[PDB]
Design an enzyme around this catalytic site. Sequence first.
Site: not given
Length: 484
Positions: A17, A226, A236
Amino acid sequence: AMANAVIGNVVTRFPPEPSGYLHVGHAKAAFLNNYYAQMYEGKMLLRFDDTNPVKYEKSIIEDLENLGLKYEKISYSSDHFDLLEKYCIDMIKMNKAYADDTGVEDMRNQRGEGIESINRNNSIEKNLELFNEMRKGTEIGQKNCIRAKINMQSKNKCMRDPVMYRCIVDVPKYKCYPTYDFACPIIDSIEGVTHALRTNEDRIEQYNWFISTLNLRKVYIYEFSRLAFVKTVMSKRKLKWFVENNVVDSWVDPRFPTIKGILRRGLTKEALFQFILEQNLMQWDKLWSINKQIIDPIIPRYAAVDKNSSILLILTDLTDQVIQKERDLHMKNKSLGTCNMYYNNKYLIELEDAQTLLENEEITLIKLGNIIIKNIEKENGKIKQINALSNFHTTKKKIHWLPYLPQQLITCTLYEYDHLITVDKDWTNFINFNSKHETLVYAEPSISSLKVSDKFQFERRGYFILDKIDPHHHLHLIKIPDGK
Ligand SMILES: [Cl-]
Ligand SMILES: [Cl-]
Ligand SMILES: [Cl-]
Ligand SMILES: [Co+2]
Ligand SMILES: [Co+2]
Ligand SMILES: [Co+2]
Ligand SMILES: [Co+2]
Ligand SMILES: [Co+2]
Ligand SMILES: [Co+2]
Ligand SMILES: [Co+2]
Ligand SMILES: [Co+2]
Protein backbone atom coordinates in the site's frame (compact mmCIF):
# COMPACT_ATOMS: atom_id res chain seq x y z
CA ALA A 1 5.77 -24.76 -3.19
CA MET A 2 4.98 -22.98 -6.49
CA ALA A 3 2.10 -25.08 -7.82
CA ASN A 4 2.68 -26.14 -11.46
CA ALA A 5 5.44 -23.56 -11.81
CA VAL A 6 6.99 -23.45 -15.29
CA ILE A 7 10.41 -22.00 -16.08
CA GLY A 8 10.00 -18.71 -17.94
CA ASN A 9 6.26 -18.45 -17.17
CA VAL A 10 6.08 -17.41 -13.50
CA VAL A 11 4.85 -13.93 -12.64
CA THR A 12 4.76 -12.76 -9.03
CA ARG A 13 3.84 -9.35 -7.68
CA PHE A 14 4.76 -7.31 -4.64
CA PRO A 15 1.67 -5.21 -3.75
CA PRO A 16 2.45 -2.69 -1.00
CA GLU A 17 0.00 0.00 0.00
CA PRO A 18 1.36 3.49 -0.78
CA SER A 19 0.11 4.42 2.72
CA GLY A 20 3.47 4.48 4.46
CA TYR A 21 7.11 3.47 4.36
CA LEU A 22 8.28 -0.07 3.83
CA HIS A 23 9.23 -1.85 7.06
CA VAL A 24 11.09 -5.16 7.32
CA GLY A 25 7.86 -7.16 7.30
CA HIS A 26 7.36 -5.84 3.77
CA ALA A 27 10.92 -7.02 3.08
CA LYS A 28 10.08 -10.69 3.58
CA ALA A 29 7.24 -10.35 1.03
CA ALA A 30 9.20 -8.36 -1.55
CA PHE A 31 12.16 -10.72 -1.25
CA LEU A 32 10.09 -13.90 -1.51
CA ASN A 33 8.30 -12.56 -4.59
CA ASN A 34 11.67 -11.87 -6.20
CA TYR A 35 13.10 -15.21 -5.02
CA TYR A 36 10.37 -17.27 -6.63
CA ALA A 37 10.42 -15.21 -9.84
CA GLN A 38 14.20 -15.72 -10.11
CA MET A 39 13.95 -19.43 -9.26
CA TYR A 40 11.61 -19.88 -12.25
CA GLU A 41 13.22 -17.28 -14.59
CA GLY A 42 10.05 -15.22 -14.47
CA LYS A 43 8.81 -11.70 -13.73
CA MET A 44 7.92 -9.71 -10.63
CA LEU A 45 5.39 -6.91 -10.89
CA LEU A 46 5.24 -3.95 -8.55
CA ARG A 47 1.65 -3.04 -7.83
CA PHE A 48 0.68 -0.13 -5.64
CA ASP A 49 -2.36 -1.38 -3.80
CA ASP A 50 -4.53 1.75 -3.62
CA THR A 51 -7.88 -0.07 -3.24
CA ASN A 52 -9.47 2.15 -0.61
CA PRO A 53 -9.12 5.96 -0.50
CA VAL A 54 -6.73 7.41 2.06
CA LYS A 55 3.08 10.32 -2.17
CA TYR A 56 5.02 7.37 -0.72
CA GLU A 57 5.68 5.81 -4.16
CA LYS A 58 9.12 7.43 -4.24
CA SER A 59 10.18 6.01 -0.87
CA ILE A 60 9.00 2.51 -1.78
CA ILE A 61 10.80 2.56 -5.13
CA GLU A 62 13.99 3.76 -3.44
CA ASP A 63 13.81 1.03 -0.77
CA LEU A 64 13.20 -1.65 -3.41
CA GLU A 65 16.24 -0.41 -5.30
CA ASN A 66 18.30 -0.44 -2.07
CA LEU A 67 17.26 -4.04 -1.55
CA GLY A 68 18.39 -4.84 -5.08
CA LEU A 69 14.90 -5.89 -6.17
CA LYS A 70 13.98 -5.11 -9.76
CA TYR A 71 10.50 -5.39 -11.22
CA GLU A 72 9.22 -5.56 -14.78
CA LYS A 73 6.39 -3.06 -14.49
CA ILE A 74 4.60 -0.74 -12.05
CA SER A 75 0.80 -0.69 -11.82
CA TYR A 76 -1.93 0.55 -9.51
CA SER A 77 -4.98 -1.35 -8.34
CA SER A 78 -7.04 1.73 -9.28
CA ASP A 79 -5.89 1.21 -12.90
CA HIS A 80 -8.59 -1.52 -13.10
CA PHE A 81 -11.59 0.04 -11.31
CA ASP A 82 -13.58 0.32 -14.56
CA LEU A 83 -12.97 -3.36 -15.18
CA LEU A 84 -13.92 -4.23 -11.63
CA GLU A 85 -17.22 -2.36 -11.98
CA LYS A 86 -17.91 -4.28 -15.19
CA TYR A 87 -17.23 -7.55 -13.46
CA CYS A 88 -19.43 -6.56 -10.55
CA ILE A 89 -22.27 -5.98 -12.98
CA ASP A 90 -21.55 -9.31 -14.65
CA MET A 91 -21.69 -10.81 -11.16
CA ILE A 92 -25.10 -9.27 -10.53
CA LYS A 93 -26.41 -10.52 -13.86
CA MET A 94 -25.41 -14.12 -13.12
CA ASN A 95 -27.30 -13.66 -9.80
CA LYS A 96 -23.94 -14.08 -8.06
CA ALA A 97 -24.07 -10.70 -6.28
CA TYR A 98 -26.74 -8.53 -4.74
CA ALA A 99 -27.22 -5.10 -3.23
CA ASP A 100 -27.69 -5.18 0.55
CA ASP A 101 -28.84 -2.26 2.71
CA THR A 102 -28.56 -4.11 6.03
CA GLY A 103 -26.57 -2.22 8.66
CA VAL A 104 -23.11 -3.17 9.87
CA GLU A 105 -23.84 -4.63 13.31
CA ASP A 106 -26.92 -6.54 12.15
CA MET A 107 -25.00 -7.86 9.15
CA ARG A 108 -22.18 -9.16 11.36
CA ASN A 109 -24.75 -10.85 13.59
CA GLN A 110 -26.66 -12.28 10.63
CA ARG A 111 -23.39 -13.60 9.18
CA GLY A 112 -22.43 -15.19 12.49
CA GLU A 113 -25.79 -16.99 12.80
CA GLY A 114 -25.66 -17.97 9.10
CA ILE A 115 -29.00 -16.35 8.28
CA GLU A 116 -29.40 -15.15 4.72
CA SER A 117 -30.15 -11.46 4.35
CA ILE A 118 -33.50 -10.06 3.21
CA ASN A 119 -32.00 -8.75 -0.03
CA ARG A 120 -30.12 -11.95 -0.95
CA ASN A 121 -32.95 -12.80 -3.43
CA ASN A 122 -33.30 -9.31 -4.91
CA SER A 123 -33.97 -9.44 -8.62
CA ILE A 124 -31.17 -8.75 -11.05
CA GLU A 125 -32.92 -5.57 -12.19
CA LYS A 126 -33.20 -4.35 -8.60
CA ASN A 127 -29.59 -5.21 -7.79
CA LEU A 128 -28.53 -3.25 -10.89
CA GLU A 129 -30.70 -0.27 -9.89
CA LEU A 130 -29.14 -0.18 -6.44
CA PHE A 131 -25.61 -0.59 -7.77
CA ASN A 132 -26.24 2.40 -10.01
CA GLU A 133 -27.33 4.38 -6.96
CA MET A 134 -24.04 3.33 -5.31
CA ARG A 135 -22.19 4.52 -8.42
CA LYS A 136 -23.86 7.93 -8.39
CA GLY A 137 -23.25 8.61 -4.69
CA THR A 138 -26.90 9.14 -3.63
CA GLU A 139 -28.14 8.56 -0.06
CA ILE A 140 -29.81 5.41 -1.36
CA GLY A 141 -26.43 4.37 -2.74
CA GLN A 142 -24.58 5.25 0.47
CA LYS A 143 -27.01 2.95 2.28
CA ASN A 144 -26.08 0.02 0.01
CA CYS A 145 -23.16 -2.28 -0.59
CA ILE A 146 -22.81 -5.12 -3.11
CA ARG A 147 -22.19 -8.54 -1.60
CA ALA A 148 -21.17 -11.75 -3.31
CA LYS A 149 -23.83 -14.46 -3.23
CA ILE A 150 -21.90 -17.53 -2.10
CA ASN A 151 -23.05 -19.62 0.87
CA MET A 152 -24.39 -18.07 4.09
CA GLN A 153 -24.31 -21.48 5.81
CA SER A 154 -20.70 -22.33 4.88
CA LYS A 155 -18.37 -23.44 7.65
CA ASN A 156 -15.89 -20.76 6.40
CA LYS A 157 -16.95 -17.19 7.28
CA CYS A 158 -15.21 -15.75 4.24
CA MET A 159 -17.71 -17.66 2.08
CA ARG A 160 -20.73 -16.11 3.86
CA ASP A 161 -21.54 -13.40 1.30
CA PRO A 162 -18.43 -11.18 1.58
CA VAL A 163 -18.82 -7.52 0.66
CA MET A 164 -17.53 -6.70 -2.86
CA TYR A 165 -18.24 -3.01 -3.44
CA ARG A 166 -18.78 -0.20 -0.97
CA CYS A 167 -19.98 3.34 -1.36
CA ILE A 168 -17.42 5.87 -0.07
CA VAL A 169 -18.51 9.52 -0.41
CA ASP A 170 -16.43 11.18 2.27
CA VAL A 171 -12.70 10.82 1.66
CA PRO A 172 -10.84 11.83 -1.56
CA LYS A 173 -13.39 10.35 -9.53
CA TYR A 174 -15.24 7.29 -8.20
CA LYS A 175 -18.09 7.16 -5.68
CA CYS A 176 -17.88 3.39 -5.08
CA TYR A 177 -14.86 1.20 -4.52
CA PRO A 178 -14.24 -2.55 -4.66
CA THR A 179 -13.16 -4.22 -1.51
CA TYR A 180 -9.69 -5.71 -1.13
CA ASP A 181 -11.19 -9.24 -1.18
CA PHE A 182 -12.93 -8.68 -4.53
CA ALA A 183 -10.27 -6.51 -6.14
CA CYS A 184 -7.32 -8.77 -5.40
CA PRO A 185 -8.19 -12.06 -7.27
CA ILE A 186 -9.53 -10.18 -10.30
CA ILE A 187 -6.58 -7.82 -10.62
CA ASP A 188 -4.15 -10.70 -10.13
CA SER A 189 -5.81 -12.63 -12.97
CA ILE A 190 -5.98 -9.71 -15.37
CA GLU A 191 -2.39 -8.61 -14.70
CA GLY A 192 -1.08 -12.09 -15.53
CA VAL A 193 0.03 -13.11 -12.02
CA THR A 194 0.64 -16.84 -11.83
CA HIS A 195 1.60 -17.17 -8.16
CA ALA A 196 0.21 -14.64 -5.70
CA LEU A 197 2.06 -14.58 -2.40
CA ARG A 198 0.65 -13.39 0.90
CA THR A 199 0.72 -13.84 4.64
CA ASN A 200 -0.79 -16.96 6.16
CA GLU A 201 -2.98 -15.04 8.61
CA ASP A 202 -8.72 -18.42 5.16
CA ARG A 203 -9.47 -16.15 2.23
CA ILE A 204 -8.01 -18.69 -0.24
CA GLU A 205 -11.38 -20.38 -0.75
CA GLN A 206 -13.12 -17.07 -1.41
CA TYR A 207 -10.38 -15.82 -3.78
CA ASN A 208 -10.68 -19.03 -5.82
CA TRP A 209 -14.49 -18.69 -5.79
CA PHE A 210 -14.20 -15.18 -7.29
CA ILE A 211 -11.83 -16.36 -10.03
CA SER A 212 -13.86 -19.40 -11.09
CA THR A 213 -17.29 -17.73 -10.76
CA LEU A 214 -16.10 -15.10 -13.30
CA ASN A 215 -14.34 -17.70 -15.53
CA LEU A 216 -10.97 -15.93 -15.30
CA ARG A 217 -7.55 -17.47 -15.72
CA LYS A 218 -6.56 -19.36 -12.58
CA VAL A 219 -4.06 -17.88 -10.09
CA TYR A 220 -2.33 -19.92 -7.37
CA ILE A 221 -1.90 -18.52 -3.85
CA TYR A 222 1.24 -19.31 -1.85
CA GLU A 223 1.21 -18.44 1.83
CA PHE A 224 4.20 -17.39 3.88
CA SER A 225 4.53 -16.48 7.53
CA ARG A 226 4.64 -12.80 8.47
CA LEU A 227 8.05 -11.57 9.71
CA ALA A 228 7.83 -9.33 12.78
CA PHE A 229 10.29 -8.57 15.59
CA VAL A 230 10.23 -8.29 19.39
CA LYS A 231 10.24 -4.84 21.02
CA THR A 232 9.37 -3.29 17.66
CA VAL A 233 6.54 -0.83 17.13
CA MET A 234 5.15 -1.30 13.64
CA SER A 235 1.74 0.30 14.13
CA LYS A 236 1.87 3.36 11.87
CA ARG A 237 -0.12 5.44 14.39
CA LYS A 238 2.47 4.91 17.14
CA LEU A 239 5.38 5.58 14.79
CA LYS A 240 3.58 8.83 13.96
CA TRP A 241 3.39 9.47 17.71
CA PHE A 242 7.15 8.94 18.10
CA VAL A 243 7.92 11.42 15.31
CA GLU A 244 5.33 14.05 16.31
CA ASN A 245 6.51 14.20 19.93
CA ASN A 246 10.24 14.53 19.05
CA VAL A 247 11.17 11.10 20.42
CA VAL A 248 12.96 10.46 17.20
CA ASP A 249 13.48 13.35 14.80
CA SER A 250 12.62 11.53 11.53
CA TRP A 251 11.07 8.42 9.97
CA VAL A 252 14.58 7.19 9.02
CA ASP A 253 15.72 6.93 12.66
CA PRO A 254 17.89 3.80 13.22
CA ARG A 255 15.45 2.62 15.95
CA PHE A 256 12.59 2.42 13.42
CA PRO A 257 11.84 -0.94 11.78
CA THR A 258 11.60 0.85 8.47
CA ILE A 259 13.84 -0.27 5.69
CA LYS A 260 15.65 2.96 5.50
CA GLY A 261 16.30 2.99 9.16
CA ILE A 262 17.67 -0.46 9.38
CA LEU A 263 20.06 -0.07 6.61
CA ARG A 264 21.08 3.12 8.31
CA ARG A 265 21.55 0.95 11.43
CA GLY A 266 24.13 -1.20 9.56
CA LEU A 267 22.13 -4.20 8.23
CA THR A 268 23.13 -5.66 4.89
CA LYS A 269 20.41 -6.70 2.49
CA GLU A 270 22.34 -9.96 2.21
CA ALA A 271 21.96 -10.56 5.95
CA LEU A 272 18.21 -9.93 5.74
CA PHE A 273 17.74 -12.26 2.77
CA GLN A 274 19.84 -14.98 4.39
CA PHE A 275 17.91 -14.60 7.64
CA ILE A 276 14.62 -15.01 5.78
CA LEU A 277 15.80 -18.14 3.93
CA GLU A 278 17.03 -19.62 7.22
CA GLN A 279 14.11 -18.61 9.48
CA ASN A 280 5.14 -14.80 16.61
CA LEU A 281 7.84 -12.21 17.04
CA MET A 282 11.40 -13.07 15.96
CA GLN A 283 14.62 -12.28 17.84
CA TRP A 284 17.09 -9.70 16.46
CA ASP A 285 20.15 -11.65 17.61
CA LYS A 286 20.20 -14.21 14.79
CA LEU A 287 19.80 -11.43 12.22
CA TRP A 288 22.65 -9.30 13.59
CA SER A 289 24.96 -12.32 13.95
CA ILE A 290 24.33 -13.24 10.31
CA ASN A 291 25.11 -9.63 9.45
CA LYS A 292 28.31 -9.72 11.48
CA GLN A 293 29.60 -12.87 9.85
CA ILE A 294 28.82 -11.38 6.45
CA ILE A 295 30.58 -8.06 7.00
CA ASP A 296 33.48 -9.01 9.29
CA PRO A 297 35.71 -10.52 6.54
CA ILE A 298 35.21 -7.62 4.12
CA ILE A 299 35.37 -4.40 6.18
CA PRO A 300 38.50 -2.49 7.29
CA ARG A 301 39.74 -2.17 10.82
CA TYR A 302 40.59 1.04 12.56
CA ALA A 303 41.30 2.15 16.11
CA ALA A 304 39.57 4.62 18.39
CA VAL A 305 39.97 5.64 22.01
CA ASP A 306 37.63 7.53 24.30
CA LYS A 307 38.44 11.19 23.78
CA ASN A 308 38.45 12.16 27.45
CA SER A 309 39.10 9.09 29.58
CA SER A 310 42.10 8.05 27.47
CA ILE A 311 45.45 8.07 29.26
CA LEU A 312 48.75 9.40 27.90
CA LEU A 313 51.35 6.65 27.42
CA ILE A 314 54.95 7.72 26.81
CA LEU A 315 57.68 5.51 25.37
CA THR A 316 60.65 7.31 26.96
CA ASP A 317 63.36 5.79 24.73
CA LEU A 318 61.91 7.27 21.52
CA THR A 319 61.94 10.77 20.09
CA ASP A 320 59.03 12.92 18.96
CA GLN A 321 59.76 12.14 15.30
CA VAL A 322 56.71 10.76 13.52
CA ILE A 323 57.45 7.41 11.89
CA GLN A 324 54.87 6.16 9.41
CA LYS A 325 54.50 2.57 8.21
CA GLU A 326 52.13 0.97 5.74
CA ARG A 327 49.74 -1.66 7.13
CA ASP A 328 46.79 -3.70 5.88
CA LEU A 329 43.29 -2.41 6.49
CA HIS A 330 42.40 -6.09 7.01
CA MET A 331 44.97 -8.54 8.39
CA LYS A 332 43.43 -11.58 6.67
CA ASN A 333 42.13 -9.77 3.55
CA LYS A 334 44.72 -8.09 1.30
CA SER A 335 42.09 -6.86 -1.20
CA LEU A 336 40.87 -4.09 1.16
CA GLY A 337 44.30 -2.52 0.74
CA THR A 338 46.63 -0.55 2.96
CA CYS A 339 46.48 2.38 5.34
CA ASN A 340 49.22 4.52 6.83
CA MET A 341 50.10 4.14 10.51
CA TYR A 342 51.79 6.93 12.51
CA TYR A 343 53.79 6.64 15.68
CA ASN A 344 55.85 8.77 18.01
CA ASN A 345 56.95 8.64 21.56
CA LYS A 346 53.51 9.58 22.77
CA TYR A 347 50.34 7.51 22.69
CA LEU A 348 46.74 7.36 23.89
CA ILE A 349 45.23 4.27 25.50
CA GLU A 350 41.89 3.47 27.13
CA LEU A 351 41.60 4.09 30.85
CA GLU A 352 39.94 0.69 30.97
CA ASP A 353 43.25 -0.67 29.65
CA ALA A 354 45.50 1.75 31.58
CA GLN A 355 44.13 0.87 35.00
CA THR A 356 45.11 -2.82 34.44
CA LEU A 357 48.88 -2.28 34.28
CA LEU A 358 51.65 -2.26 36.88
CA GLU A 359 55.40 -1.65 36.91
CA ASN A 360 57.65 -3.97 34.87
CA GLU A 361 55.04 -5.74 32.74
CA GLU A 362 55.18 -6.50 29.01
CA ILE A 363 52.18 -5.84 26.74
CA THR A 364 51.65 -5.43 22.98
CA LEU A 365 50.39 -2.33 21.19
CA ILE A 366 48.50 -4.02 18.33
CA LYS A 367 50.01 -3.64 14.84
CA LEU A 368 53.05 -1.92 16.44
CA GLY A 369 54.86 -4.11 18.97
CA ASN A 370 55.53 -4.87 22.58
CA ILE A 371 56.42 -2.38 25.31
CA ILE A 372 57.51 -2.71 28.93
CA ILE A 373 55.60 -0.63 31.48
CA LYS A 374 57.84 1.15 34.00
CA ASN A 375 55.66 3.47 36.10
CA ILE A 376 52.15 4.86 36.62
CA GLU A 377 51.65 8.51 37.60
CA LYS A 378 48.45 8.99 39.62
CA GLU A 379 47.33 12.46 40.74
CA ASN A 380 44.16 13.07 42.80
CA GLY A 381 43.60 9.29 42.88
CA LYS A 382 43.15 8.64 39.15
CA ILE A 383 45.82 7.57 36.68
CA LYS A 384 47.57 10.55 35.06
CA GLN A 385 50.25 8.97 32.81
CA ILE A 386 51.90 5.72 31.90
CA ASN A 387 55.67 5.61 31.31
CA ALA A 388 57.07 2.66 29.38
CA LEU A 389 59.96 1.61 27.13
CA SER A 390 59.75 0.55 23.49
CA ASN A 391 60.47 -3.11 22.73
CA PHE A 392 59.09 -3.43 19.22
CA HIS A 393 61.31 -6.23 18.20
CA THR A 394 54.69 -14.06 25.20
CA THR A 395 51.96 -11.64 26.04
CA LYS A 396 48.34 -11.94 26.76
CA LYS A 397 47.60 -8.20 27.03
CA LYS A 398 47.40 -6.88 23.45
CA ILE A 399 45.72 -3.45 23.46
CA HIS A 400 44.81 -0.88 20.82
CA TRP A 401 46.16 2.67 20.84
CA LEU A 402 46.33 5.95 18.95
CA PRO A 403 49.31 8.22 18.31
CA TYR A 404 49.02 11.38 20.35
CA LEU A 405 48.88 13.60 17.25
CA PRO A 406 45.85 15.78 18.04
CA GLN A 407 45.92 17.73 14.78
CA GLN A 408 45.57 14.46 12.86
CA LEU A 409 43.31 12.45 15.20
CA ILE A 410 39.81 12.56 13.72
CA THR A 411 37.05 13.28 16.22
CA CYS A 412 33.93 11.12 16.08
CA THR A 413 30.67 10.57 17.94
CA LEU A 414 29.53 6.97 18.44
CA TYR A 415 25.73 6.53 18.57
CA GLU A 416 24.63 3.29 20.23
CA TYR A 417 20.89 2.66 20.05
CA ASP A 418 18.53 0.40 21.96
CA HIS A 419 14.90 -0.52 21.38
CA LEU A 420 12.26 2.22 21.52
CA ILE A 421 9.88 0.15 23.67
CA THR A 422 10.76 -2.06 26.63
CA VAL A 423 8.22 -4.90 26.39
CA ASP A 424 7.95 -7.20 23.40
CA LYS A 425 4.32 -6.65 22.32
CA ASP A 426 -1.29 3.68 27.51
CA TRP A 427 1.49 2.00 25.55
CA THR A 428 3.61 5.16 25.95
CA ASN A 429 4.28 3.93 29.51
CA PHE A 430 6.94 1.57 28.14
CA ILE A 431 8.96 3.91 25.90
CA ASN A 432 12.71 4.16 26.53
CA PHE A 433 12.87 7.93 25.88
CA ASN A 434 16.60 7.53 26.26
CA SER A 435 17.64 5.00 23.62
CA LYS A 436 20.38 7.06 21.89
CA HIS A 437 23.71 6.90 23.74
CA GLU A 438 26.56 9.09 22.50
CA THR A 439 30.27 8.76 23.19
CA LEU A 440 33.04 11.00 21.84
CA VAL A 441 36.21 9.34 20.58
CA TYR A 442 39.41 10.02 18.77
CA ALA A 443 40.06 7.78 15.73
CA GLU A 444 43.08 7.05 13.42
CA PRO A 445 43.76 9.67 10.70
CA SER A 446 43.31 7.08 7.92
CA ILE A 447 39.59 6.80 8.82
CA SER A 448 39.14 9.96 6.71
CA SER A 449 39.28 7.80 3.57
CA LEU A 450 35.86 6.38 4.56
CA LYS A 451 32.76 7.57 2.74
CA VAL A 452 29.18 7.76 4.01
CA SER A 453 27.57 4.35 4.77
CA ASP A 454 30.95 2.61 4.71
CA LYS A 455 31.12 -0.15 7.33
CA PHE A 456 34.15 -0.93 9.45
CA GLN A 457 35.39 -2.26 12.78
CA PHE A 458 36.92 -0.38 15.70
CA GLU A 459 39.53 -2.62 17.29
CA ARG A 460 38.28 -4.29 20.48
CA ARG A 461 35.24 -1.97 20.21
CA GLY A 462 32.84 -3.50 17.68
CA TYR A 463 31.27 -2.72 14.34
CA PHE A 464 30.25 0.69 12.99
CA ILE A 465 28.81 2.43 9.95
CA LEU A 466 29.63 6.01 8.96
CA ASP A 467 26.30 7.80 8.94
CA LYS A 468 27.44 11.39 8.32
CA ILE A 469 30.41 13.74 8.03
CA ASP A 470 30.30 17.03 9.99
CA PRO A 471 31.93 20.39 9.30
CA HIS A 472 35.46 20.71 10.72
CA HIS A 473 35.84 16.99 9.86
CA HIS A 474 33.83 15.24 12.58
CA LEU A 475 32.30 11.86 11.98
CA HIS A 476 29.00 10.41 13.20
CA LEU A 477 29.22 6.63 13.43
CA ILE A 478 26.38 4.28 14.34
CA LYS A 479 27.25 1.14 16.27
CA ILE A 480 25.99 -1.98 14.46
CA PRO A 481 24.69 -4.69 16.83
CA ASP A 482 26.71 -7.90 16.55
CA GLY A 483 24.44 -10.59 18.02
CA LYS A 484 26.53 -11.28 21.12
CL1 LIG B 1 7.35 -19.17 5.67
CL1 LIG C 1 2.36 -1.79 17.33
CL1 LIG D 1 18.55 11.46 13.00
CO1 LIG E 1 19.16 -18.04 -13.37
CO1 LIG F 1 0.04 8.26 -4.06
CO1 LIG G 1 -23.97 11.50 3.05
CO1 LIG H 1 17.90 -6.76 22.47
CO1 LIG I 1 63.03 -0.42 15.79
CO1 LIG J 1 20.00 2.58 26.82
CO1 LIG K 1 27.67 16.58 15.49
CO1 LIG L 1 30.80 17.32 15.49
